[PDB]
Amino acid sequence: NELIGQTVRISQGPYKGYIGVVKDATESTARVELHSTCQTISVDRQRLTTVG
Amino acid sequence: KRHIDQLKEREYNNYSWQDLVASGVVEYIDTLEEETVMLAMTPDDLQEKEVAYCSTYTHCEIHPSMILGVCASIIPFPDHNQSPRNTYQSAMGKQAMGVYITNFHVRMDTLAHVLYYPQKPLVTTRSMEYLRFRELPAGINSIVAIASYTGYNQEDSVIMNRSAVDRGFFRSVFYRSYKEQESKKGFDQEEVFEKPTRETCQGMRHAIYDKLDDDGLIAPGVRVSGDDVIIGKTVTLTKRDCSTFLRTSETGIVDQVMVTLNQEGYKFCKIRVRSVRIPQIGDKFASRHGQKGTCGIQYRQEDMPFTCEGITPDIIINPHAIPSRMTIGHLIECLQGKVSANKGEIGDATPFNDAVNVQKISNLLSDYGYHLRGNEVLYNGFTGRKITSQIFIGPTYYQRLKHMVDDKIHSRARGPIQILNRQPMEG
Amino acid sequence: MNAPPAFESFLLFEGEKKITINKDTKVPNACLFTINKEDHTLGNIIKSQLLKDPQVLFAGYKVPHPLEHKIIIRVQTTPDYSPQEAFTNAITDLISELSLLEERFRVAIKDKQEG
Amino acid sequence: PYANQPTVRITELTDENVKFIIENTDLAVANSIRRVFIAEVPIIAIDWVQIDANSSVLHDEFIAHRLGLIPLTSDDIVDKLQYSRDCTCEEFCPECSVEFTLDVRCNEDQTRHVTSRDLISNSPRVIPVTSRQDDILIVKLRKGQELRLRAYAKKGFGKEHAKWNPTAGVAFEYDPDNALRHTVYPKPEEWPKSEYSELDEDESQAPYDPNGKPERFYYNVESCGSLRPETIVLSALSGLKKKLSDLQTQLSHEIQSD
Amino acid sequence: QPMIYICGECHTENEIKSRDPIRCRECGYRIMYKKRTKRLVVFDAR
Amino acid sequence: MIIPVRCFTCGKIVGNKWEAYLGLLQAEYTEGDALDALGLKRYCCRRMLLAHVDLIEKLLNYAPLEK
Amino acid sequence: FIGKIPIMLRSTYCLLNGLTDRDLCELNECPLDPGGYFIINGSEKVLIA
Amino acid sequence: EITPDLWQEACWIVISSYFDEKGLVRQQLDSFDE
Amino acid sequence: SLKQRLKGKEGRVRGNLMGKRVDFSARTVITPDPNLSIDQVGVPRSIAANMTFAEIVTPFNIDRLQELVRRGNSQYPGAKYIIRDNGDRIDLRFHPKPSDLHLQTGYKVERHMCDGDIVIFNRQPTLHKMSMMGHRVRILPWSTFRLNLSVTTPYNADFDGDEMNLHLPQSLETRAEIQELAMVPRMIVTPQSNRPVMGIVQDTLTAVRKFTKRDVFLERGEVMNLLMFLSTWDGKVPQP
Amino acid sequence: TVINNWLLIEGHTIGIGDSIADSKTYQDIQNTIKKAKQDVIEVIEKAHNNELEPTPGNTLRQTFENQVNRILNDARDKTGSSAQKSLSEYNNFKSMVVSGAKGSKINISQVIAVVGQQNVEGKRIPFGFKHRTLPHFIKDDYGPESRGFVENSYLAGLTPTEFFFHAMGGREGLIDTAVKTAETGYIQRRLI
Amino acid sequence: RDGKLAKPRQLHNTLWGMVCPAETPEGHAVGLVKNLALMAYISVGSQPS
RNA sequence: UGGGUGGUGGCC
Ligand SMILES: [Mg+2]
Ligand SMILES: [Zn+2]
Ligand SMILES: [Zn+2]
Ligand SMILES: [Zn+2]
């Protein structure tokens, strides 16, 4: 899976502008661990943007 | 007076404590010799001429407050507290976080706690000057109000100010160091630092190795999380994974990684991971008088009560914690904190002083426009209405213990199992 | 770990109605307005304005839990006056009051800035 | 059954605080205004930091936290910028954020004070409060230590975080004399007179008023410097009125759909 | 692959390869600290 | 370790008063007069300067890890 | 040679003896450290009386 | 000469001198040196 | 020796027969929460999202269980395993193929713990019968067990750092056995001394003594504000 | 739910002002303590002149201690009763005691009037040293302040010797707490 | 430990100025662990010749 | 690579 193991930037929503690394993903959404907080959240793949 | 005058110049004069012992002014006394001496608690009182009690004194105590240990000499007004409270404070005085050593950024210690903004007490004892407490403090002076606000702080619980915490109040960072070296169990058993692959490595977990670089060591500044590879380590038989994982529910950041050699010349590395701990709910806070408690809820600034001026308490503690434990020293410290803050000088709470009492502090507080007993009129934070009872409020030294809730939460549902008796493991 | 994100206090998510109305059945002409993502800042003024209306027989608000952001306002009026129109009249009165207040404050600021 | 007519009197106005008085109003409205001063007044503050190099003795998160608390002059931009959760732009655009740059290196022997004057922004209308008495200290650097970073400032209000609170201290007080007896003094004579007390030195409190209501709410709103102290009050009233308008719109929609 | 390190005391950027005795090419100091990462780090100022 | 940017309780800006406070202290000024010479009125702000210990100066003595 | 005796910090026979605080800071050992503990395999051990 | 009723100031000078000469862990260092 | 393996405490009989370590358990600090009924316990999301409860699929609940299976294991109100009636179990944490997400009537769903579930909640020094009551779950944001204050007196809890265990019954019969026997409201009166074990304490007691004095008068606004908090109120305002 | 929300209007607290007497009860307490000291001195004097008739079934030392303890307990009870009589209707200790929420009248007495007399093993402070309790005292002294009678109150602070005797009295509670847990669990285990 | 004896645990009169009357663990080792007072000093010994 | 031993500490 391409999305697994990628540094991603959230493109829209309240979490817009934040960064993280995708841990697990599906055909609909994905799980991103935030670099700034001690928590892993779930975000939609459409609002995602791979950086680097 | 000559001895004192020479002592006051001891950086110019070579006159020191040894020269004081030499002149036969002080005399070391052990217990058996103590059995036969006559001791005077203080000269200017117990040696004047009255109806002769003993009139045969052979020694005199230097200062009565010198009989307390290191930990119990930081309690302010300890002679005003119930006896077990001092013991509890001494117990919990060794678990408060603070700058534990000046050069803490070099040492690769395990489980290092350090607080962002430690402060010296607004009301100290003369004894903690020689403990260097005013250089490595542990705690923050906080505006504490003793009132039942919402019922969220009843059974030894406290309410904290969310806005104050957002402003860094009691924020702390938590270090943790890892160690791993490669040792030769045999010519056929050799361990190396090397990034495992999905092609040749047989035994592996569900943690990918992209975080670490080709060296097998994760570089500093890389976000980590539970069950993530840290030191890529393989063994030879062919190649099985022996890599170390950051333990579950840590989610820190690799602070620094040092690489060196042991006596045998093997490669060696210690990795430090840092984590910031905001004072969330369930954390343990304690006063200097054995008043331990856990946060019950965090209200924002506009929800807390306020005075005529916009002063909102940082912590609110229940009134029911005082009467049973009779920690009147806590109340006296809170009352004198107001005087110290307004007057601008650091108050003194040496145990047996006799120059400081409640009446003097009350008059000094009245000389600044506050109620002489330290009470204030608060307004309700939600409806803005006055409160029919005046609330006792003032600065107080609190200290945040190391028993964080995030280190104690734990749950299980069909996890690992023992080998001898197939029951769940422990820990 | 279990810390909620900071914006849960004031942001509505998908499918969350801002205000919901349910007819109370115990007594006639009573309704329960459940407003999401609000706090005392709004409920207190709404309730206070509702008490000035002489056609209202009951008006109070409560927050079921400080860790959840929603308040319930209960209104009971006389038979010839629906609670909903009382609520909307209170809203209009509050808005008019605030507009007048800001206008007079601007006038006072202009007066002060030029002696 | 209708809202009464409040009046405003301003007794003192500087560029740090405003001291006014409000007449003929219910206590709940006054308290809610006091509340909106604290929480729901939008303001600009930096909320996104990327650190390139940090040789200082303070870890990166500590630097970011200290940076976030620096007040920024947002007087005419706060009402023009859109909330980042609402801007349809990709990543960050000048319409919804401001970019800051910091690059300080200590090569001289003496210590180097990294202050807010070293924060360089691309928007002249949004700068930290050192426009024209030292600056906010961030770190101190020894020889050989450097700190390079890049930050973004966006729009928020105090209900989200305390770095978006615009007011330093808001003082609120009604009925300086205890005429309404909301508070009950055990021994009245022990209590100092209030600042706004219209009472002679003999008596301690006003005689009881059986039929009275809270009026004449005194205020003293002090700004942390990011907004002019009157702009705080104006923005608070505007925000409260807008919140009520939105509630009314949703209420009408729900009523006409039942 | 070069795996640049930093000496413990002289702080001189020196390169060491895999399976090589850890030593600063000068001053013989045996403590090496890894350099900071290159991937992006983003901290919110809350 | 270093002076907080903002007063914890009220929110006043205090992180710029530290150097001025020290300078006033290196004169005839007492703390009770130095504090309100700086405009610190509420005791919540006063205690922020009054009871703060500055460990950054000691930390600056150790040689940096890099050069 | 007979053996190696572990040395207790800030003793007469420890390298951190008589040094000025400036030297201690230059050696990455703060002057506030009391000493009085042994270092065994990199762990600080204290002898309880 | 006698030190009357200013003894509070003089009482802690000897304590300060004592802790300047002998540290807080002097017993350990003395025992190991011996 | 063999005798040492089962001699005394931590032996066979006393360490692995009369006492074991069980699955489906949780433990966290406790903090007060005066807004929960005395038979409620507030659990955090991370604990709730980790402890499952098997549920039998049924035409009356197949749709909701299907939606939960669709949600998965990441999103909280989801499932963790789906068990076929033949004994085989399909994991849900490893992005399974959409064919396996289909569930029949006789299947089992290992869903997460939602509101209304029944748990056992004890404090380790288990002295008497009233230290092992059962509560109803209510999920709340932060990471701590929240319980009402009138319930502290039986448990002898103190909110000063104490911790309590949480056991989740894993079968319908066990759930009905707990609900009908050891709910908190059924344990108000102890059989030890035929008197209540739960009473009004702390601020509530002090303020109810102050509240019922002869000279406590309330205007209509405060009376409405107080009546807003009566759950059993009949909506009639008494004559003043 | 109802009471915790009316409390927001009423409020409740505790402070230094709730632990103060009217400076006229202080004189009464001081007079009571002075009279108690005089009475124990008189008993001691009558004892050393062999003018003490032994109490039925008690030795001379036993009856001496009995009169001493009776006088001290009378002093403590009288001072406590005066302190209770002194409290106002707005005091917070009284409000939290009369409702039974926390504390008891003895706590009020110890905070305001007098801490009382310390004991170990049900007896006054033993002669740990040779025929005296502390080096600061004199041999064969059976007076009140030399055997653990704390004259002051928690508000007024404790003198050094009274502080040490209070610490001795406190240690017994910790020891009892340590042993009671170890015994009761075993008893219940055997019963079940 | 695990001894019902209380005499070794009690605070003796002789512990005045030598041992802290307050600081002590409250677990199973209450009274058996002690800390020196601030002025206390331990003798090092000398030859009696 | 797991077992074993000891110490410290938390709540009663
Ligand atoms: Mg407890
Ligand atoms: Zn934009
Ligand atoms: Zn080198
Ligand atoms: Zn302040």
mmCIF file with all atom_site columns, N, CA and C in Angstrom, chain K residues 5-43:
data_model
loop_
_atom_site.group_PDB
_atom_site.id
_atom_site.type_symbol
_atom_site.label_atom_id
_atom_site.label_alt_id
_atom_site.label_comp_id
_atom_site.label_asym_id
_atom_site.label_entity_id
_atom_site.label_seq_id
_atom_site.pdbx_PDB_ins_code
_atom_site.Cartn_x
_atom_site.Cartn_y
_atom_site.Cartn_z
_atom_site.occupancy
_atom_site.B_iso_or_equiv
_atom_site.pdbx_formal_charge
_atom_site.auth_seq_id
_atom_site.auth_comp_id
_atom_site.auth_asym_id
_atom_site.auth_atom_id
_atom_site.pdbx_PDB_model_num
ATOM 1   N N  . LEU K 1 5  ? 6.632  -6.591 67.098 1.00 0.00 ? 5  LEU K N  1
ATOM 2   C CA . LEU K 1 5  ? 7.242  -5.750 68.120 1.00 0.00 ? 5  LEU K CA 1
ATOM 3   C C  . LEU K 1 5  ? 7.136  -4.279 67.740 1.00 0.00 ? 5  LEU K C  1
ATOM 4   N N  . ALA K 1 6  ? 6.749  -3.449 68.711 1.00 0.00 ? 6  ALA K N  1
ATOM 5   C CA . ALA K 1 6  ? 6.631  -2.015 68.500 1.00 0.00 ? 6  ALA K CA 1
ATOM 6   C C  . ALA K 1 6  ? 7.723  -1.204 69.181 1.00 0.00 ? 6  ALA K C  1
ATOM 7   N N  . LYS K 1 7  ? 8.441  -1.786 70.141 1.00 0.00 ? 7  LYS K N  1
ATOM 8   C CA . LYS K 1 7  ? 9.517  -1.058 70.811 1.00 0.00 ? 7  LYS K CA 1
ATOM 9   C C  . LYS K 1 7  ? 10.598 -0.573 69.853 1.00 0.00 ? 7  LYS K C  1
ATOM 10  N N  . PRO K 1 8  ? 11.116 -1.381 68.919 1.00 0.00 ? 8  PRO K N  1
ATOM 11  C CA . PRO K 1 8  ? 12.102 -0.846 67.969 1.00 0.00 ? 8  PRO K CA 1
ATOM 12  C C  . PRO K 1 8  ? 11.542 0.213  67.038 1.00 0.00 ? 8  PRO K C  1
ATOM 13  N N  . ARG K 1 9  ? 10.222 0.316  66.908 1.00 0.00 ? 9  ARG K N  1
ATOM 14  C CA . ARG K 1 9  ? 9.615  1.263  65.984 1.00 0.00 ? 9  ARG K CA 1
ATOM 15  C C  . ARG K 1 9  ? 9.261  2.598  66.625 1.00 0.00 ? 9  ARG K C  1
ATOM 16  N N  . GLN K 1 10 ? 9.062  2.638  67.938 1.00 0.00 ? 10 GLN K N  1
ATOM 17  C CA . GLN K 1 10 ? 8.611  3.862  68.578 1.00 0.00 ? 10 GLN K CA 1
ATOM 18  C C  . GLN K 1 10 ? 9.702  4.927  68.555 1.00 0.00 ? 10 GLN K C  1
ATOM 19  N N  . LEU K 1 11 ? 9.280  6.171  68.758 1.00 0.00 ? 11 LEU K N  1
ATOM 20  C CA . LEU K 1 11 ? 10.184 7.317  68.766 1.00 0.00 ? 11 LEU K CA 1
ATOM 21  C C  . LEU K 1 11 ? 10.737 7.467  70.176 1.00 0.00 ? 11 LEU K C  1
ATOM 22  N N  . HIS K 1 12 ? 11.987 7.062  70.365 1.00 0.00 ? 12 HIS K N  1
ATOM 23  C CA . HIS K 1 12 ? 12.594 7.125  71.685 1.00 0.00 ? 12 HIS K CA 1
ATOM 24  C C  . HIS K 1 12 ? 12.946 8.561  72.047 1.00 0.00 ? 12 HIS K C  1
ATOM 25  N N  . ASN K 1 13 ? 13.011 8.827  73.353 1.00 0.00 ? 13 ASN K N  1
ATOM 26  C CA . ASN K 1 13 ? 13.398 10.154 73.822 1.00 0.00 ? 13 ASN K CA 1
ATOM 27  C C  . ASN K 1 13 ? 14.785 10.536 73.338 1.00 0.00 ? 13 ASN K C  1
ATOM 28  N N  . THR K 1 14 ? 15.675 9.557  73.192 1.00 0.00 ? 14 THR K N  1
ATOM 29  C CA . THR K 1 14 ? 17.060 9.846  72.858 1.00 0.00 ? 14 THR K CA 1
ATOM 30  C C  . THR K 1 14 ? 17.236 10.378 71.445 1.00 0.00 ? 14 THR K C  1
ATOM 31  N N  . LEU K 1 15 ? 16.218 10.287 70.598 1.00 0.00 ? 15 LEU K N  1
ATOM 32  C CA . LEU K 1 15 ? 16.334 10.762 69.221 1.00 0.00 ? 15 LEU K CA 1
ATOM 33  C C  . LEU K 1 15 ? 16.039 12.250 69.114 1.00 0.00 ? 15 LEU K C  1
ATOM 34  N N  . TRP K 1 16 ? 16.671 13.058 69.954 1.00 0.00 ? 16 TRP K N  1
ATOM 35  C CA . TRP K 1 16 ? 16.454 14.497 69.952 1.00 0.00 ? 16 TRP K CA 1
ATOM 36  C C  . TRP K 1 16 ? 17.714 15.146 69.402 1.00 0.00 ? 16 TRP K C  1
ATOM 37  N N  . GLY K 1 17 ? 17.607 15.734 68.217 1.00 0.00 ? 17 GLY K N  1
ATOM 38  C CA . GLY K 1 17 ? 18.738 16.359 67.578 1.00 0.00 ? 17 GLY K CA 1
ATOM 39  C C  . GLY K 1 17 ? 19.643 15.419 66.819 1.00 0.00 ? 17 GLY K C  1
ATOM 40  N N  . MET K 1 18 ? 19.376 14.116 66.851 1.00 0.00 ? 18 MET K N  1
ATOM 41  C CA . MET K 1 18 ? 20.141 13.149 66.079 1.00 0.00 ? 18 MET K CA 1
ATOM 42  C C  . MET K 1 18 ? 19.380 12.571 64.900 1.00 0.00 ? 18 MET K C  1
ATOM 43  N N  . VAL K 1 19 ? 18.068 12.402 65.018 1.00 0.00 ? 19 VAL K N  1
ATOM 44  C CA . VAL K 1 19 ? 17.252 11.792 63.977 1.00 0.00 ? 19 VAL K CA 1
ATOM 45  C C  . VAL K 1 19 ? 15.986 12.621 63.820 1.00 0.00 ? 19 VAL K C  1
ATOM 46  N N  . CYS K 1 20 ? 15.519 12.753 62.583 1.00 0.00 ? 20 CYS K N  1
ATOM 47  C CA . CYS K 1 20 ? 14.324 13.537 62.319 1.00 0.00 ? 20 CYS K CA 1
ATOM 48  C C  . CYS K 1 20 ? 13.116 12.887 62.984 1.00 0.00 ? 20 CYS K C  1
ATOM 49  N N  . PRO K 1 21 ? 12.378 13.610 63.828 1.00 0.00 ? 21 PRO K N  1
ATOM 50  C CA . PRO K 1 21 ? 11.182 13.025 64.447 1.00 0.00 ? 21 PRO K CA 1
ATOM 51  C C  . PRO K 1 21 ? 10.040 12.798 63.478 1.00 0.00 ? 21 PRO K C  1
ATOM 52  N N  . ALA K 1 22 ? 10.086 13.386 62.285 1.00 0.00 ? 22 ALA K N  1
ATOM 53  C CA . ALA K 1 22 ? 8.974  13.343 61.347 1.00 0.00 ? 22 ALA K CA 1
ATOM 54  C C  . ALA K 1 22 ? 9.218  12.425 60.161 1.00 0.00 ? 22 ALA K C  1
ATOM 55  N N  . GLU K 1 23 ? 10.385 12.511 59.531 1.00 0.00 ? 23 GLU K N  1
ATOM 56  C CA . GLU K 1 23 ? 10.617 11.788 58.288 1.00 0.00 ? 23 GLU K CA 1
ATOM 57  C C  . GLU K 1 23 ? 10.782 10.299 58.560 1.00 0.00 ? 23 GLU K C  1
ATOM 58  N N  . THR K 1 24 ? 9.874  9.495  58.010 1.00 0.00 ? 24 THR K N  1
ATOM 59  C CA . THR K 1 24 ? 9.936  8.041  58.092 1.00 0.00 ? 24 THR K CA 1
ATOM 60  C C  . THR K 1 24 ? 8.936  7.421  57.125 1.00 0.00 ? 24 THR K C  1
ATOM 61  N N  . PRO K 1 25 ? 9.267  6.293  56.502 1.00 0.00 ? 25 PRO K N  1
ATOM 62  C CA . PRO K 1 25 ? 8.296  5.625  55.631 1.00 0.00 ? 25 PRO K CA 1
ATOM 63  C C  . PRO K 1 25 ? 7.096  5.147  56.430 1.00 0.00 ? 25 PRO K C  1
ATOM 64  N N  . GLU K 1 26 ? 5.944  5.098  55.768 1.00 0.00 ? 26 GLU K N  1
ATOM 65  C CA . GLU K 1 26 ? 4.701  4.694  56.409 1.00 0.00 ? 26 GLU K CA 1
ATOM 66  C C  . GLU K 1 26 ? 4.240  3.309  55.980 1.00 0.00 ? 26 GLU K C  1
ATOM 67  N N  . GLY K 1 27 ? 5.084  2.554  55.287 1.00 0.00 ? 27 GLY K N  1
ATOM 68  C CA . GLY K 1 27 ? 4.721  1.212  54.878 1.00 0.00 ? 27 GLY K CA 1
ATOM 69  C C  . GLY K 1 27 ? 5.001  0.178  55.948 1.00 0.00 ? 27 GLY K C  1
ATOM 70  N N  . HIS K 1 28 ? 5.385  -1.029 55.532 1.00 0.00 ? 28 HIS K N  1
ATOM 71  C CA . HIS K 1 28 ? 5.726  -2.077 56.484 1.00 0.00 ? 28 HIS K CA 1
ATOM 72  C C  . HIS K 1 28 ? 7.017  -1.790 57.237 1.00 0.00 ? 28 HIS K C  1
ATOM 73  N N  . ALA K 1 29 ? 7.809  -0.821 56.789 1.00 0.00 ? 29 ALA K N  1
ATOM 74  C CA . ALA K 1 29 ? 9.076  -0.474 57.418 1.00 0.00 ? 29 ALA K CA 1
ATOM 75  C C  . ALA K 1 29 ? 8.976  0.842  58.182 1.00 0.00 ? 29 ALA K C  1
ATOM 76  N N  . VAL K 1 30 ? 7.825  1.095  58.801 1.00 0.00 ? 30 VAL K N  1
ATOM 77  C CA . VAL K 1 30 ? 7.641  2.335  59.542 1.00 0.00 ? 30 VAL K CA 1
ATOM 78  C C  . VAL K 1 30 ? 8.439  2.278  60.835 1.00 0.00 ? 30 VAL K C  1
ATOM 79  N N  . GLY K 1 31 ? 9.230  3.319  61.085 1.00 0.00 ? 31 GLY K N  1
ATOM 80  C CA . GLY K 1 31 ? 10.041 3.397  62.276 1.00 0.00 ? 31 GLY K CA 1
ATOM 81  C C  . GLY K 1 31 ? 11.368 2.682  62.199 1.00 0.00 ? 31 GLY K C  1
ATOM 82  N N  . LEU K 1 32 ? 11.569 1.820  61.206 1.00 0.00 ? 32 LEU K N  1
ATOM 83  C CA . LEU K 1 32 ? 12.825 1.102  61.054 1.00 0.00 ? 32 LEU K CA 1
ATOM 84  C C  . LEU K 1 32 ? 13.786 1.782  60.093 1.00 0.00 ? 32 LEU K C  1
ATOM 85  N N  . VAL K 1 33 ? 13.346 2.827  59.401 1.00 0.00 ? 33 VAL K N  1
ATOM 86  C CA . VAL K 1 33 ? 14.196 3.616  58.519 1.00 0.00 ? 33 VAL K CA 1
ATOM 87  C C  . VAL K 1 33 ? 14.187 5.046  59.031 1.00 0.00 ? 33 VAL K C  1
ATOM 88  N N  . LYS K 1 34 ? 15.371 5.624  59.187 1.00 0.00 ? 34 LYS K N  1
ATOM 89  C CA . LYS K 1 34 ? 15.521 6.913  59.839 1.00 0.00 ? 34 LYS K CA 1
ATOM 90  C C  . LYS K 1 34 ? 16.480 7.781  59.040 1.00 0.00 ? 34 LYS K C  1
ATOM 91  N N  . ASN K 1 35 ? 16.352 9.091  59.221 1.00 0.00 ? 35 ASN K N  1
ATOM 92  C CA . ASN K 1 35 ? 17.208 10.054 58.549 1.00 0.00 ? 35 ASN K CA 1
ATOM 93  C C  . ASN K 1 35 ? 17.818 11.002 59.567 1.00 0.00 ? 35 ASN K C  1
ATOM 94  N N  . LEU K 1 36 ? 19.083 11.341 59.348 1.00 0.00 ? 36 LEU K N  1
ATOM 95  C CA . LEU K 1 36 ? 19.811 12.187 60.278 1.00 0.00 ? 36 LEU K CA 1
ATOM 96  C C  . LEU K 1 36 ? 19.189 13.572 60.358 1.00 0.00 ? 36 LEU K C  1
ATOM 97  N N  . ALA K 1 37 ? 19.283 14.177 61.538 1.00 0.00 ? 37 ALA K N  1
ATOM 98  C CA . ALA K 1 37 ? 18.980 15.589 61.653 1.00 0.00 ? 37 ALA K CA 1
ATOM 99  C C  . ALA K 1 37 ? 20.022 16.399 60.887 1.00 0.00 ? 37 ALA K C  1
ATOM 100 N N  . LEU K 1 38 ? 19.813 17.711 60.835 1.00 0.00 ? 38 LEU K N  1
ATOM 101 C CA . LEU K 1 38 ? 20.664 18.538 59.989 1.00 0.00 ? 38 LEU K CA 1
ATOM 102 C C  . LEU K 1 38 ? 22.045 18.741 60.600 1.00 0.00 ? 38 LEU K C  1
ATOM 103 N N  . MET K 1 39 ? 22.121 18.899 61.918 1.00 0.00 ? 39 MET K N  1
ATOM 104 C CA . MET K 1 39 ? 23.400 19.127 62.576 1.00 0.00 ? 39 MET K CA 1
ATOM 105 C C  . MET K 1 39 ? 24.096 17.847 63.010 1.00 0.00 ? 39 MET K C  1
ATOM 106 N N  . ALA K 1 40 ? 23.442 16.697 62.885 1.00 0.00 ? 40 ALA K N  1
ATOM 107 C CA . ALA K 1 40 ? 24.029 15.453 63.356 1.00 0.00 ? 40 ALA K CA 1
ATOM 108 C C  . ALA K 1 40 ? 25.317 15.145 62.607 1.00 0.00 ? 40 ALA K C  1
ATOM 109 N N  . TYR K 1 41 ? 26.272 14.556 63.318 1.00 0.00 ? 41 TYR K N  1
ATOM 110 C CA . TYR K 1 41 ? 27.541 14.146 62.740 1.00 0.00 ? 41 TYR K CA 1
ATOM 111 C C  . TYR K 1 41 ? 27.922 12.794 63.318 1.00 0.00 ? 41 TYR K C  1
ATOM 112 N N  . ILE K 1 42 ? 28.444 11.918 62.469 1.00 0.00 ? 42 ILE K N  1
ATOM 113 C CA . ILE K 1 42 ? 28.823 10.569 62.867 1.00 0.00 ? 42 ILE K CA 1
ATOM 114 C C  . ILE K 1 42 ? 30.314 10.545 63.152 1.00 0.00 ? 42 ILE K C  1
ATOM 115 N N  . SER K 1 43 ? 30.683 10.038 64.324 1.00 0.00 ? 43 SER K N  1
ATOM 116 C CA . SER K 1 43 ? 32.088 9.953  64.691 1.00 0.00 ? 43 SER K CA 1
ATOM 117 C C  . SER K 1 43 ? 32.814 8.968  63.787 1.00 0.00 ? 43 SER K C  1
#
